[PDB]
Design a binder for these strands. Structure first.
Length: 246
RNA sequence: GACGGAGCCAGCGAGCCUUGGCCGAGAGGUCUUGGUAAAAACUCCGUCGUGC
RNA sequence: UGGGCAUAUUCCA
């Protein structure tokens, strides 16, 4: 087949070249026939994968930020045994600006691999979080909810942290992967990870990626592009653009 | 002596290198990626107690 | 009439 022959020599290409030996993420690059249309949401959006896990909250570090009072919410998730392990560190921004300003910032994505923040206080992350975090892997913080619905028409309503819900979408972001909308021709999605899958699991990851990505129901967040794709290339971090479809 | 919170006062001022796609003869643009580089003090509240 | 948070207002003097 077209794909799996190009994947075998890619996996052999991993274990022979030391520039490729140190980068374990696998991306795909999508040439679309025209440009996509919209840009600079700076928000990832998640695809529902239908077969197999990528990661789980046991295995990695999870980091949370909120608005004042953070002391009200930093106790609830650790006084429940379901969610006490599901995070590593929990603060607000107002500690975060004075804890790690500037030169310590290089050890941020060294010491972490997933960042999440409250939906209210997301719109100022790259200011205090720093420019150098962008955009080397294009890892970016995620947006979740702290409770159920709070409406805001004419009354000023308080909310309480519901831990089982945080557990519910927090388990939901680990099994899947996401993507970044932009206004260009090319589009990259990490879909593969070495020593954790087989080849046809990756084949179903790619065929599922075409399933959700070319959803013709014109749904918000579901099937954005139109007009059909040109080609799909595969590279890890420094390997060449090896095609599957042309 | 640590650790972690919460409290809170001022004055001098504006008064950097990479991987790859798409278009373009080209000049170049347009992006996706990896690494390296850049108030304090104090007040109180709770946990632990000496190694060159 | 003057300040605060949210970004047919609301609270305070």
């Amino acid at each position: 087949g077209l794909a799996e022959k190009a994947l075998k020599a890619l996996i052999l290409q991993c274990e022979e070249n030391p520039s490729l030996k140190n980068d374990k993420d696998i991306h795909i690059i999508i040439n679309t026939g025209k440009k996509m249309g919209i840009n600079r949401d700076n928000i990832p959006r998640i695809i529902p994968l239908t077969k197999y896990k990528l990661f789980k909250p046991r295995d990695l570090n999870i980091l949370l930020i909120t608005k004042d009072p953070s002391a009200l919410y930093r106790e609830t998730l650790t006084k429940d045994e379901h969610t006490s392990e599901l995070f590593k560190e929990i603060i607000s921004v107002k500690n975060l600006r004075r804890r790690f300003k500037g030169s310590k910032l290089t050890q941020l994505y060294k010491d972490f691999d997933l960042v999440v923040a409250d939906y209210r206080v997301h719109h100022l992350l790259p200011e205090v979080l720093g420019s150098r975090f962008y955009h080397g892997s294009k890892k970016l913080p995620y947006m979740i909810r702290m409770s159920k619905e709070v409406k805001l028409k004419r009354q000023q309503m308080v909310e309480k942290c519901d831990p089982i819900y945080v557990r519910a979408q927090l388990r939901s972001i680990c099994k899947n992967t996401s993507y970044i909308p932009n206004n260009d021709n090319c589009l990259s999605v990490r879909v593969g990870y070495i020593q954790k899958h087989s080849i046809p699991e990756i084949l179903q990851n790619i065929q599922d990626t075409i399933n959700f990505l070319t959803d013709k129901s014109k749904r918000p967040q579901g099937g954005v592009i139109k007009g059909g794709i040109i080609s799909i290339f595969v590279k890890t971090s420094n390997s060449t653009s090896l095609p599957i479809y042309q």
